[PDB]
Design a protein around this ligand. Structure first.
Ligand SMILES: [Zn+2]
Length: 58
């Protein structure tokens, strides 16, 4: 669906460890590499707000 900006982030892996996959949100941040624990990211835009719910009663 082309109704947004970023919705995948097809990165690659850790620069120090192309094997170890950086994790999303470093303890409330960007992409944390479990091995070097490096954090990458900042954008990701702000979408969390538009409706975001599970069906309604009305
Ligand atoms: Zn690493």
């Amino acid at each position: 669906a082309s109704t947004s900006r970023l919705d995948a982030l097809p990165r690659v892996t850790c620069p120090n460890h192309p094997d170890a996959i950086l994790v999303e949100d470093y303890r409330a941040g960007d992409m944390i590499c479990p091995e070097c624990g490096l954090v990458v990211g900042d954008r990701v835009i702000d979408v969390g707000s538009e409706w975001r719910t599970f069906s309604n009663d009305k």
